[PDB]
Each structure stands twice: as C-alpha cells, then as structure tokens.
Design a protein around this ligand. Structure first.
Ligand SMILES: Nc1nc2c(c(=O)[nH]1)N[C@H]1C(S)=C(S)[C@@H](COP(=O)(O)OP(=O)(O)OC[C@H]3O[C@@H](n4cnc5c(=O)[nH]c(N)nc54)[C@H](O)[C@@H]3O)O[C@H]1N2
Ligand SMILES: Nc1nc2c(c(=O)[nH]1)N[C@H]1C(S)=C(S)[C@@H](COP(=O)(O)OP(=O)(O)OC[C@H]3O[C@@H](n4cnc5c(=O)[nH]c(N)nc54)[C@H](O)[C@@H]3O)O[C@H]1N2
Ligand code: SF4
Ligand code: SF4
Ligand code: SF4
Ligand code: SF4
Ligand code: SF4
Ligand code: SF4
Ligand code: SF4
Ligand code: SF4
Ligand code: SF4
Ligand code: SF4
Ligand code: SF4
Ligand code: SF4
Ligand code: SF4
Ligand code: SF4
Ligand SMILES: [K+]
Ligand SMILES: [K+]
Ligand SMILES: [K+]
Ligand SMILES: [K+]
Ligand SMILES: [K+]
Ligand SMILES: [K+]
Ligand SMILES: [Mg+2]
Ligand SMILES: [S]
Ligand SMILES: [W+6]
Lengths: 80, 429, 129, 267, 348, 80
C-alpha cells in the first residue's frame, strides 16, 4: 500500500515537512511553532544527522502535506 | 552516549539555537534538528585536515612550530607593517572580535569583516535611507506576506522557511496556509518552487523593477509596458498584494547586493518598504550570511562608531567603503600585509585580490585546510566557536545568543590567540 | 558560446565547505557549472564532460552538470568558490564588494582536466615570506 | 607665486596629503614646506621625504600656484578644503582630489580617482583625463552633498557622479557608467557622451542633461515631450531634448532629465 | 604623418600638426550618390556601385578613401548632400568655418503655424522630423455622473461585458464557505467612462444610476481642446527634399535646396528593375499602381519637386535609362579658384 | 572591385535572375517576357547546361536585382 518513504540522499534537512505535518504539530507545540523538538516526543519524522528520518510511520495518515512542502522530492507517498 | 540540548549552531545567520548534539567520547558524532549544513560543521568528515598545531612555511614548505613562535612572528609582521589588513571575523564570537578591534587600533590597521563581500552594500544603503526591521518572532506570529528577494534559503538558510513560514504563530495559527509567499529571482530555485508568486525577473534589473513598483505605489503611471521582463499589469498586481498585507516581511540576499547597482538596489528596496507603511505594515530583514557576521558589525560599531572598512592608520577611526575595504586595499596594492581570521578569502575573493595575497605576508587563524592556508605564511589553529568555545553571536536581525561549549579542545581560542598577539605587538612598538 | 555567469550557494557546496575544502567532495560540489539540458545539447556535451570558461578577467575548467534549478535562457551557474572566482568580475565600483554575479563569459568544451583545490591556487604563484 | 613639487617615486602604500594646498603653503619658506606633515600609511612623515621642493614663497593663498610636475597616482586628498589659489598636477592623482573644496582651482592633467570634488562648496576642478566613481558626491550616510562649484571631466567617469548633489555643476565630456545623479536634490549635471543606465535614479530635484545615448532609463519618470534651445544654469544648449520629470519613486519629485533626441528615440 | 582609422564601416582620416585635420565618414548616412568621388581633386575617393550597396548585403564600406593621396581640403565634405563626410579642423567642423565654402540649404517649421498633425513626420523619407503633441485627457472631453449600488448589484457581469471602454471592474472570486459570494466589489473608472448609458440599460436590477451632461452642460464643463506640441528637424539626417513643405496642410514648413537641375527618364529603355526607386533617398521615383483593371500607367513616375539632383538614381541604373542634369549649385562665396573649378565641374 | 560571381553548383537553372536583369530585358524581348533567348543575343548571363552562365560581365551594372530574385544565393555581387 501507499506509505511514507524518505530519500535522505536528496534531503536538505530544512525541516519544512517536520513542521508542516499536522500529526507532528498536534503532538509537539515546538514543532507546531516551527522549532525542532527539544522535549522528548514521539512524532512521525525528524531531521537527524542533517536529513529526514522516519521514526513513527504508523502515525502517518497519508494526507500529502509534507510532500507539498518539500521542493526537492526528498519525502514522498508511494507504494511500500 | 549523551545528548546536549539547546545548542546554537555556528554556520549561517539563521543562528538556530535548538540543536541537539550527540556527544560520545569528547567528540561530536551526530546532531538532531540541524540541517545538512549545520550537521556537517558539528561532525568531523574523515580524511579532512584539522590542524593540530601552528605552522610556518619556509618559502615553500610548512613546518610545525609552537604557539609562541607563530604568534611572535605574526606580531612582528603586523608591527612592522604600514598598512596591515585584518580581515574575516564573521565566524568567531564577539569577545574575540572586540580584541581584534583593539589590536587593529594598536597596529594602525584597517579592520574589516566579510560584510565587505556580502551585505556591506546593505550597510551603505541603510546608512543613506534607513533600516526598517523586526525580529523573527514578529514574522512568525504576524507575517501575512513573506518575500524572499534574491535569496535562496533552501540552499543558504535551510531551516529559515520552516521556522518563519511553515511555523504556526500567534496570529497565523495555520502557518504556511496563512501567508502569501513571494520569491524574486531570475532562476527557478527550490525556494522559488515553494512560492505562491515567483517574479522570474531579468538579471541585474531589480533597480528598474523596484523603481516601477514604487512609482506605481505612489499613484504614478508606469512609463514602459514591461520592466525587468515583467509586464506592467503584473507590476501593479504585485504592488496590490503588498499594499493589502496586514504584516509584510522582505527578506533579501546576495542576488541584489552582488548585482549591478549593489548598495543602490538595497536602497530602493528599503525606501519601498518604508513608503508601504502608509498602506500596510511592512518591514525588512537582510539575510546575513555567517552566524556572526552581524556580531562583528555590532562590536565594531559600538567600539569605534563605524561598522566595517574601519581604518585606524591615523589614530582616529575613519570610514570609506570603496577605499578602506579588504578588496580595495588588495586590488589597489595598498595593503602590505594581511591577517585572516575565521574566513577564507583565498576561496572567496576574486582573482585580482588573490594576485596581491600572493605577494604579501598572510597570517591565517584557521582550524582547517583551505585555499587561504595554501596562500598563508603563518597558520595558527584555534578552538572552534560553538563546538569547543563559547561566546556571544548575533542573529541576522540583531538578536544576541550565546554560543555554547560542547566538547573540550586543547587548542587555544581565537580570543586568547588575539590577546597574545596584541601583547607582542605592543612589545615591538 | 556567450552566456551570462551567475554564482552562489548550493546545499552540497555548503556541506562540502563544512566537511573540508581539502576534500574531493568540495571539487565535486564547487568545481562545476550548472546548465539547462537544452544548452548542453547545443554545445554537444553531457553530464560529467568538462568546460572551459573564459572571461575578461580569467579562465577556469569546470565539470558540466545538469541544473535541477532551471536557469533563464542563456545563463549558467557556478557555485561560489575559487573556481568561480577565477573568472568573475573583481571591480567593486568603489563599494568594496566585487561583482560576483551575472558576468558575460565564453564557454567551450574541453578535454582538459579539472584542477583540484591546491593545484588551482598555484596559478596565483604564492611566494614564501 | 610658483612653487614646484617634483614627486619622487611613489610608494605602494599611498600617501594622504591634505596639507598640499595654497592655504597651508602660504606664508612659509621652502624649508618649512619641506617639513609639512603628510601621511604614508600608519606613519606620519614629511612632504620633503617624497617631494623635492623649489620655487618662490608667498604669504597669501590667492597668489600661490602649486605645480606637481610628475605623476602622483598614489597620493590622496590633494587640495582638500582649499580656499583659494591654484594647483596643477602634471600627471595622475588618487582619491579625494579637491574634497571639501571652497574656492580656487585644481587642474589634473591625467586621471583622477574616486571622490574627486566630494562635498565641493566652491571653486573649480578640471580633470583632463578619466575620473573614478563618486565625482562630486556626498559622504556616507549624509543627505547633504556638494553644494557649489564646478567639476569638468574631459574623459570618462564611472558610477554615481553627483550623488546627493545639492548645487554646483558637473560636466563629463565623455561617457559615464550607471546611476549619474543618484539621489540628486539640486544642481546641474551635463554628460556629453553616453550613459549606461539609471540616469537620475531617485532624484528629487536638479537637472541632468545627456547629449549622447542612454542605453536604459527608468519607469518612474513621466515624459513631458521635447524642448528645444534650453538654458540651464548659465549654459546654452543647442538642439532638441526629450524631457522627463522624476524620479517619481520619490515623493514630491521635481527632477528633470533632458535626453538628446538624435540618439534616444528608444527612450 | 597621416592616419586612417576604420571603425566598423566608418572611416576616419586624420593628420596631426600645428593644424589638426580630420575627415570623418559615416557609412550609415551615405546615399552612395558618388559626388564626393567626382569632386575630389586628387582622386582619393572610390565609390562602390550604388545599387549593390543599397540592395545587397556587403561588408565593404560604401566608399574608400586613400590616405596617401588625400590632401584633406574638404571639398567632398562641402559637397556631400547627406552630411556623411565631415572635415574637422582643430576640431571644429568646416560648416562653422567661414573660410570654407558651404552649400546653401535649409529646412524650417514655423511652430506657431504648426498644428501638430504629424503628416511631415510620416512623409519624411529620412525620418529627420520629430513632432510631439499632448492631447487632452479623455475625462476632460466628456461629462456625467455614474454610481453603482453594490447592495442592489447581483454581480451578473453584464455591464462589465457590455462596457465599450472597459470602465467597469468586478472583483470576481470563487466562493468559499467563509466568503459565499461570486464577487466582493464593483467599480466604475471615471477616467475611462464616456457616459454612453449602455451599462444602466443592460442592468437587470437597475443598480446603476447614470446621467450624461454633455449636451446641456458641455459648454461649461468641457473645455475647448487646445493641442500643444513642438517640432524638430535633425540637420544631419535632413536632406532638403521638401516633402514636409509639400505635405503640410497649413504651409508651416519651408525648404530650400542646394542644386537646381532636371530629371530625364526614357520610359522605353527602363525595364522597371526598381533599383533607382529603392536608391532614391528623397522618394522622388515610384511605380504607380493602376487604379482600374485594364488601365496602364507610366512605367517610372517622377516628381522633381522632391528632387535634389544628387545623381544616385542615374548612377544606379544599369541601362542609363535615367539621367540627371545640374545647372546651379548654390554656395556661400568662394574665393579659392581651385574650389570654383571643382564646383563648376559638377555642373551639366 | 565588386562584381558578379556565379555559384553554379548551388544553381537550380530556374532563370529568375536572367529574366529579372534589366540589361538582359532591354536586349532581348523574349527574356523581358520571361522566356529563354531563342534569337542569338549578347546578354550578361544565361542558363546553360542547366545552370547560370555569365557571358558578358562587362555589361553588368551591379544594380542587385538578380541577387534579390535568387532564393539560393547562387548569383552574387562580391569582391572579384
Ligand atoms: N550552503 C551554503 N549556505 C550558506 C553559505 C555557503 O557558502 N553555503 N554562506 C552563507 C553566506 S556568507 C551568505 S551571504 C548567505 C547567502 O545567501 P543568498 O543571499 O541566497 O546568496 P546566493 O545563494 O549566493 O544568491 C542568492 C540568489 O540570488 C540570485 N540572483 C542572481 N542574480 C540576481 C539578480 O540580478 N537579481 C536577483 N533578484 N537575484 C539574483 C541567484 O539565483 C541566487 O539564487 O548564505 C549563507 N549560507
Ligand atoms: N563567486 C562568489 N564568491 C563569493 C560569494 C558569491 O556569492 N559568489 N559570496 C561572498 C560572501 S557573501 C562571503 S561572506 C564569502 C564567504 O566568506 P568566508 O569567510 O570565506 O566563508 P567560509 O568559507 O565559510 O569561511 C569560514 C572559515 O572560518 C573557519 N572557522 C569556523 N569556525 C571558526 C572559529 O571558531 N574560529 C576561526 N578562527 N575560524 C573558524 C572555517 O574553517 C572556514 O574555513 O564569499 C564571498 N565570495
Ligand atoms: S503525510 Fe500527512 S501525515 Fe504522513 S507525514 Fe506527510 S504529513 Fe504528516
Ligand atoms: S524532506 Fe524535503 S523537506 Fe522534509 S526536510 Fe528533507 S527536504 Fe526539507
Ligand atoms: S540553519 Fe543555518 S543555522 Fe539553523 S541550522 Fe541549518 S545552518 Fe545551522
Ligand atoms: S557624397 Fe554621395 S557618396 Fe560621397 S559620401 Fe556624401 S553621400 Fe556617400
Ligand atoms: S578631402 Fe579634399 S582630398 Fe581628401 S578627399 Fe575629401 S576631397 Fe579628396
Ligand atoms: S508641420 Fe505642417 S505638417 Fe509637419 S506638422 Fe506642423 S503641420 Fe502637420
Ligand atoms: S449589471 Fe446591474 S448587476 Fe449585473 S453587475 Fe453591472 S450592475 Fe451589478
Ligand atoms: S457608461 Fe458607457 S462607459 Fe461609463 S460605464 Fe456604463 S458603459 Fe462603460
Ligand atoms: S444626447 Fe442626451 S445623451 Fe446623447 S449625449 Fe447629448 S446628452 Fe449625453
Ligand atoms: S526636408 Fe526632406 S528631409 Fe529635411 S525634413 Fe522636410 S523632409 Fe525630412
Ligand atoms: S530606371 Fe534604370 S533603374 Fe530605375 S528602374 Fe528603369 S531601370 Fe531599374
Ligand atoms: S532622384 Fe533626384 S534625388 Fe532621388 S536620386 Fe535621382 S536625383 Fe538624387
Ligand atoms: S541563379 Fe539563383 S536564380 Fe539565376 S538561376 Fe541559378 S538559381 Fe535560378
Ligand atoms: S546585376 Fe543588376 S545587372 Fe549585373 S546582372 Fe544582376 S542584374 Fe543584370
Ligand atoms: K514535492
Ligand atoms: K566538520
Ligand atoms: K584606405
Ligand atoms: K467590456
Ligand atoms: K503644402
Ligand atoms: K539572394
Ligand atoms: Mg550619502
Ligand atoms: S556573511
Ligand atoms: W556572506
């Protein structure tokens, strides 16, 4: 089925997807307000060692918001 | 493994202060939240030269020396010099920059930072017409219209958009959905790809475009039916978007400081932002490059009265960019010695300046192997601010944040190196 | 071919400078020239082929790369660095700031090799002191 | 009357010589002129160390004419703030020639650097060769610039000549580059050759005349038609000129650009 | 120590000395009539074929001047009807020096008589004339009242469509649940409105009030149009054909010519290759189109009123079907006898 | 000097230049009326063996009409 897939080799670490995602926003006010998380939180993905890193793919509702926010197609919704 | 939080990143003028550092031994092995660039600074890339000790070359080849010999010969060069250039500063902390000002005073030197190849033109422009700015939080919480003019933050300030545009603010709780995003650039940059409006204007005609926009803004007719490659009708439609903002922010960068007109491109942009305040709240922020370029211009201004291109040769501080700037002294062959700190003009000056660097004594307070060290006579390695050394830095809109020390280094800090160089320069004089 | 030379930043050139300008990474990220695919076709070169850039002010050999950020017709992109700064316009017009962007250049295919970082600087002929 | 300065080979580190002016030379013997202080980098030195000095003393600056019989391309601020008298330079000069000038006249027989006649108040400057940027300009940050005098450049000048001009007259017989008359408030600029771009950018008042070709112009100007036989600041102009008023990016702008019809139909 | 500088297709011959002399040739102004080559006392000028230089692409200049033979006397400069040759002395052009004989010609517009109709600008074969005129604004030639009741307005768009001057503007939008309307505003631009009444008649809900005042109040509210402007004749592009004088409906333009002569055409020798027609810098020659079918026209039509007798047509014709005579060349007083022989040698 | 030059290898033999030339037209009524000459005539050029052939270059006045009429630049006015 269609799911979240990361392409870290294309990623900038810019964080737009992390901030744009409503699941992340709902769970972390710092993320809702555009900051990287400092408090310990369970969210779908974060920028780690400079690139996007998927941590909780089960929480992803495949809405498509992050994909629109990435200009370099480093995060996508595709099969598997 | 241990995680050090609230770290401030020492690369670009975004100056993010929410970095998590992964520390293993005494060494930084990973990061969280930092973008691809910031991460690359925090982590060592294997095969990369990190100088462990000072060096001096013997007309053609480098030999390891002690700190005292390297500092001593460097002090001798500056003491004997009649027009020394002290350039760089933007990638170290403010307390070292303050010592540099005192040392430039003592040596009768001209002190100058990377502003002279960067937002120097914005400095010249703001001195002539003004400087209407705000802090990031006003952008995040109020900004209705966000413009990136001749800057490419996705490649040059990677987290800038996520923190100021996609962020949910007090009065803009829907983040990106609450803002009209505008980008002005002759290229379809990855920043432009995210925009609601992309003015893909003709290069080096920003001044012409801004003149039409401002004439329109003040109720006048636009003379020509096309300006800077943009049709008249869309000039006015763009002016209406800006006039209808509740809160607008103009971020601008090298595309208009390096372009034809240079400081006068910034000049006309500033005066438009000012005049727009009769119709809508409007403000601007220069996208300052390095994490502490802004800090030097702050420090140099408050100690001497002038922000950069500062000449102490006569005792009094004097200021004429176009005369006393790093590239002017090198290209006009005025400088007879140069001290570089926390900068790489060998990589980033034009050929004509490097021609002069080839003929003169070059001192380089530099931790890594660079085109400047390849043109250097003395190399003095320091502890790196933000990782091994602490101190104040200033974000692109003036907000001061203290850089943190995360791990230990046996090397000396910039400030200690500069305080010893100042000690010896006096001894000789 | 007469083209307009634009220069500036890239995430890869930023990663490279903070990894190390002595590394091969930096040559791969900064010793390149970005072109629209239509322009590469017209001069008859492919990705990886080298190009000779000549201006009123200098010359350099850089590796051709297909621009993923499309350029206006007639424009090419060299990331900031010592390769770009061999050819851009040095004069500051009495402002202290050189003209790093939008410079008329001549580009030509070439079989010459890209000079690595320490070899490139020797063109300036540093004399010890 | 005539005091000769023969320059010795000029240093790579430039000289600043504000005191080379009739005002200071007046009432001094040759030996005291030999001891006048000038700057060479961060060193205070004597004029004699870089110039041989001959000629006749005089006590009033009106009667003194300084002749620099040789190239002084690396000496700045010659004639700065002079009130009377005359200076003739048989060769090139560096920056700030005649800066702050009040009266008298300077003749440069070769090229001059940037800021020739910056903050001029009265007198004459004549440059037979080329000039740099900021001919008759203001100083950084100041909105009050040149208020009087006449500058004549027989060759070409570059950028931002007459920046923030507020009186006086600049004549470039050759070509200029970009932004002539930027932020002009008052005065007269006559460019007999061509202009690359942005003549009169953000001007609020004054008059700029271009007898050659402007490659580009500015959309904030309103076209008023053509005027023939114009008379500006005591200068007679023959021929027809396209007439523009601006720069209306500025509030209340009353500046005037005249562009010769023969080479400006595209404007 | 003479010199010749070639810049593009232009030619500069200069000699230095106590008296600096310089002869400047501007290719773009040259009509290739040949007169310079004929008058030259030392045969220093070679003129390329007139037709070829006008009808075909060539890299060569229209003339060639020999440095080694040229004595820089300036007769070619004096005679040139097209101002393509200028001799300068201590750099002042000889047309301002009374020592040098000057051809007598003029072209003038009485600007008080001129009404700015612009016929002469159009007619000028050399584009030598600039005519400006400032018309009144549209708003000032028209009078009325117009206002739209936006609460009554249902935004059907019919007035915006029908408005013949696009004076009405509607702020269309796609509705949303927050803003469930198809438009948010409607406006009339009275700088454009000419009060024709169409919008008010088409309005389905009578939301537009419109009154035209032109006929009852036009005497007082509409100012009589008074159209200003000026004229300019470029003296170097100008050639004194006289088209402006003859086309002017109010006889505000006056032209005097340098040469007197005649044009002679042999219609049967002429084969209508069109060369002389294209060559003629004064638009003297034409191919009249027959007005009705079956009609015939004279093969090559002239009107010597516009003729200056430069001789370029005759020079261009490969069958010499067209010849030029020249009885009088009007000059300022000539004192040198060398100059009087050169000017008389061009008479025929 | 500038003169008439034929490039027969590019030539079509179409005859436009021969007919367009006024010298030829004046000299041969058949050429003036668009025909190839049948009567013996001395004219500037003819189509011979399928290509343009210059026979009397001295009568050429270099007016340029022939050049305008050739679409493949097979007859020209150039140096020599
Ligand atoms: N990866 C990376 N990031 C960095 C740096 C780095 O070296 N690498 N350095 C830092 C520094 S010092 C700085 S100053 C900032 C610089 O950040 P920016 O201000 O973005 O500088 P550039 O990316 O060089 O150029 C900005 C854009 O201007 C455009 N441009 C070119 N000509 C014109 C023109 O005529 N008009 C307009 N409107 N635009 C034009 C170019 O297409 C380019 O995309 O980045 C900082 N961040
Ligand atoms: N073609 C072209 N050329 C350009 C530009 C362009 O757009 N195009 N942009 C220009 C601009 S805006 C700028 S600002 C310059 C870039 O200005 P540069 O100063 O050349 O930028 P960097 O190469 O990042 O140099 C920073 C150096 O400081 C060192 N450093 C890091 N931390 C510390 C510390 O704590 N102490 C000390 N002593 N050193 C440290 C790093 O190793 C690095 O080598 O490039 C300019 N040149
Ligand atoms: S998809 Fe909708 S949910 Fe899954 S990530 Fe991108 S955004 Fe958060
Ligand atoms: S993915 Fe596209 S967006 Fe999310 S970070 Fe990597 S880049 Fe910035
Ligand atoms: S953005 Fe500039 S600052 Fe914030 S992290 Fe990426 S780099 Fe360090
Ligand atoms: S005379 Fe006839 S030909 Fe000789 S120049 Fe003036 S125009 Fe060209
Ligand atoms: S000047 Fe007297 S000589 Fe020299 S060319 Fe014109 S005419 Fe023949
Ligand atoms: S002159 Fe006679 S023609 Fe030329 S404009 Fe004035 S009126 Fe119309
Ligand atoms: S017509 Fe009557 S209604 Fe339909 S728009 Fe024009 S006005 Fe509003
Ligand atoms: S009146 Fe005639 S013009 Fe004025 S608006 Fe209604 S329609 Fe358009
Ligand atoms: S008639 Fe009544 S309506 Fe027709 S124009 Fe004269 S006034 Fe306006
Ligand atoms: S005369 Fe022939 S040329 Fe001189 S102006 Fe009247 S028309 Fe144009
Ligand atoms: S006259 Fe001589 S030139 Fe004018 S057309 Fe008849 S032929 Fe061709
Ligand atoms: S016609 Fe009268 S004017 Fe036209 S060319 Fe033959 S001569 Fe010179
Ligand atoms: S030359 Fe050009 S035209 Fe005369 S024939 Fe050969 S092709 Fe037809
Ligand atoms: S040139 Fe004029 S003349 Fe000589 S041939 Fe072609 S046409 Fe007949
Ligand atoms: K995408
Ligand atoms: K590193
Ligand atoms: K010749
Ligand atoms: K309509
Ligand atoms: K008439
Ligand atoms: K042809
Ligand atoms: Mg100023
Ligand atoms: S910077
Ligand atoms: W920078």
């Amino acid at each position: 089925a269609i799911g979240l897939k990361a392409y870290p080799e294309l990623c900038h670490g810019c964080g737009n997807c992390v901030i744009a995602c409503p699941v992340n926003a709902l769970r972390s006010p710092e993320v809702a307000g555009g900051k990287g998380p400092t408090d310990d939180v369970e969210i779908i993905m974060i920028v780690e060692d400079g690139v996007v890193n998927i941590k909780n793919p089960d929480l992803c509702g495949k809405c498509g918001t992050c994909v629109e926010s990435c200009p370099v197609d480093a995060i996508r919704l595709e099969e598997l | 493994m241990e995680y050090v939080k609230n770290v401030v990143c020492p690369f670009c003028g975004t100056l993010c202060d929410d970095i998590i550092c992964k520390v293993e031994g005494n060494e930084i092995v990973g990061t969280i939240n930092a973008c691809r660039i910031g991460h690359s600074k925090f982590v060592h890339a294997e095969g990369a030269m990190r100088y462990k000790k000072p060096l001096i070359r013997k007309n053609g080849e480098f030999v390891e020396v002690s700190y005292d010999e390297a500092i001593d010969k460097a002090a001798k060069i500056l003491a004997e010099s009649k027009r020394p250039l002290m350039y760089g500063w933007s990638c170290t902390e403010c307390e070292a920059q303050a010592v540099g000002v005192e040392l430039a005073e003592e040596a009768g030197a001209v002190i100058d930072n990377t502003a002279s190849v960067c937002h120097g033109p914005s400095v010249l422009a703001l001195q002539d017409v003004g400087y209407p700015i705000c802090t990031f939080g006003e952008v995040k919480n109020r900004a209705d219209v966000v413009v990136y003019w001749g800057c490419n933050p996705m490649h040059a300030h990677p987290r800038h958009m996520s923190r100021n545009v996609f962020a949910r603010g007090f009065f803009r709780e829907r983040g990106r959905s609450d803002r009209t995003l505008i980008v002005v650039d002759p290229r379809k940059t990855d920043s432009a790809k995210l925009a609601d409006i992309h003015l893909q204007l003709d290069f080096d005609r920003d001044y012409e475009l801004l003149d039409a926009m401002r004439a329109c803004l003040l109720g006048h007719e636009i003379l020509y039916d096309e300006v800077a490659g943009v049709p008249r009708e869309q000039i006015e439609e763009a002016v209406e978007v800006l006039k209808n903002a509740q809160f607008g922010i103009l971020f601008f960068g090298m595309g208009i400081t390096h372009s034809r007109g240079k400081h006068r491109n910034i000049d006309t942009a500033i005066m438009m932002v000012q005049d727009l305040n009769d119709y809508a709240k409007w403000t601007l922020i220069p996208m300052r490059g390095h994490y502490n370029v802004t800090g030097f211009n702050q420090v140099c201004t408050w100690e001497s009265g002038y922000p950069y291109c500062v000449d102490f040769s006569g005792g009094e501080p004097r200021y004429n960019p176009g005369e006393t700037g790093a590239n002017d002294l090198l290209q006009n062959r005025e400088a007879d010695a140069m001290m570089v700190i926390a900068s790489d003009p060998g990589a980033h000056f034009p050929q004509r300046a490097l021609e002069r660097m080839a003929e003169i004594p070059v001192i380089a307070i530099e931790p890594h192997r660079t085109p400047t060290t390849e043109m250097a006579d003395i190399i003095i390695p320091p502890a790196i601010v933000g990782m091994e050394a602490e101190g104040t830095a200033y974000r692109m809109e003036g907000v001061p944040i203290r850089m943190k020390k995360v791990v230990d280094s046996d090397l000396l800090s910039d400030r200690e190196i500069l305080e010893r160089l100042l000690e010896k320069v006096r001894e000789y004089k | 071919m007469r083209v307009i030379l634009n220069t500036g930043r890239t995430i890869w050139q930023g990663q490279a400078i903070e990894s190390g300008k002595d590394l091969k990474m930096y040559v791969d990220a900064a010793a390149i020239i970005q072109m629209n695919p239509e322009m590469m076709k017209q001069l008859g070169i492919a990705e990886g082929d080298n190009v000779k850039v000549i201006s009123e002010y200098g010359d350099v050999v850089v590796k051709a790369v297909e621009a993923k950020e499309p350029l206006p017709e007639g424009m090419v992109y060299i990331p900031m660095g010592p390769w770009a700064n061999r050819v851009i316009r040095p004069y500051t017009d009495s402002t202290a700031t050189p003209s790093f962007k939008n410079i008329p250049v001549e580009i030509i295919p070439t079989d010459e090799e890209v000079l690595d970082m320490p070899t490139l600087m020797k063109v300036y002929g540093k004399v010890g002191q | 009357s005539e005091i000769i300065l023969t320059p010795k080979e000029q240093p790579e580190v430039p000289l600043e010589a504000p005191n080379i002016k009739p005002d200071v030379f007046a009432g001094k013997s040759i030996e005291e002129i030999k001891n006048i202080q000038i700057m060479h980098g961060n060193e205070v030195v004597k004029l004699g160390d870089f110039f041989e000095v001959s000629g006749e003393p005089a006590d009033a600056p009106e009667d003194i004419k300084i002749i620099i019989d040789g190239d002084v391309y690396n000496t700045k601020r010659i004639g700065q703030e002079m009130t009377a008298g005359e200076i003739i330079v048989r060769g090139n000069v560096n920056m700030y020639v005649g800066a702050g000038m009040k009266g008298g006249k300077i003749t440069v027989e070769g090229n001059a650097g940037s800021w020739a006649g910056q903050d001029m108040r009265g007198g004459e400057i004549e440059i037979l060769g080329d000039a740099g940027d900021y001919v008759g300009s203001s100083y950084r940050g100041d909105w009050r610039g040149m208020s009087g005098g006449t500058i004549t450049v027989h060759g070409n000048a570059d950028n931002e000549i007459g920046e923030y001009m507020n009186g006086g007259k600049i004549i470039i017989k050759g070509d200029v580059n970009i932004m002539p008359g930027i932020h002009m408030n008052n005065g007269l600029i006559i460019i007999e050759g061509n202009v690359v771009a942005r003549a009169g950018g953000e001007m609020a008042g004054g008059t700029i005349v271009v007898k050659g070709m402007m490659q580009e112009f500015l959309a904030g100007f309103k076209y008023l038609g053509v005027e023939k036989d114009i008379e500006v600041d005591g200068e007679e102009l023959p021929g027809a000129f396209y007439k523009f008023e601006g720069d209306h990016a500025i509030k209340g702008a009353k500046g005037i650009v005249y562009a010769a019809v023969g080479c400006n139909g595209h404007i | 120590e003479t010199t010749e500088v070639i810049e593009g297709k232009n030619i500069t011959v200069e000699r230095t000395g106590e008296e600096n002399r310089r002869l400047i040739f501007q290719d773009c102004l040259c009509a290739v009539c040949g007169l310079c080559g004929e008058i030259c006392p030392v045969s220093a000028i070679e003129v390329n074929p007139t037709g070829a230089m006008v009808r075909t692409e060539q890299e060569k200049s229209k003339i060639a001047i020999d440095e080694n033979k040229c004595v820089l006397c300036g007769m070619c400069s004096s005679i040139c009807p097209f101002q393509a040759l200028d001799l300068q002395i201590d750099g002042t052009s000889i047309k301002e020096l009374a020592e040098y004989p000057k051809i007598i010609k003029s072209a003038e517009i009485d600007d008080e008589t001129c009404i700015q109709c612009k016929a002469c600008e159009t007619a000028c074969p050399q584009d030598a004339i600039t005519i400006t005129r400032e018309l009144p604004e549209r708003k000032d030639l028209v009078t009325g009242e117009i206002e739209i009741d936006k609460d009554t307005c249902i935004y059907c768009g019919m007035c915006e469509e029908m408005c013949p001057v696009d004076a009405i503007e509607i702020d269309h939008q796609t509705p949303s649940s927050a803003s469930p309307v198809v438009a948010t505003d409607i406006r009339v631009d009275e700088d454009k409105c000419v009060h024709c009444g169409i919008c008010k008649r088409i309005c389905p809900v009578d939301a537009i009030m419109q009154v035209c005042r032109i006929c009852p109040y036009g005497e007082y509210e509409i100012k009589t149009p008074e159209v200003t402007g000026t004229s300019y004749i470029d003296p170097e592009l100008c050639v004194n054909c006289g088209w402006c004088q003859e086309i002017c409906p109010v006889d505000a333009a006056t032209v005097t010519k340098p040469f007197e002569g005649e044009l002679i055409i042999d219609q049967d020798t002429c084969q209508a290759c069109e060369t002389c027609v294209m060559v003629c810098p004064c638009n003297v020659l034409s191919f009249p189109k027959p007005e009705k079918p079956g009609e015939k026209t004279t093969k090559l039509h002239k009107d010597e009123r516009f003729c200056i007798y430069c001789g370029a047509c005759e020079r261009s014709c490969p069958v010499t079907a067209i010849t030029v005579k020249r009885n009088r060349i009007n000059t300022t007083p000539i004192r040198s006898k060398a100059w009087k022989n050169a000017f008389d040698s061009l008479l025929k």
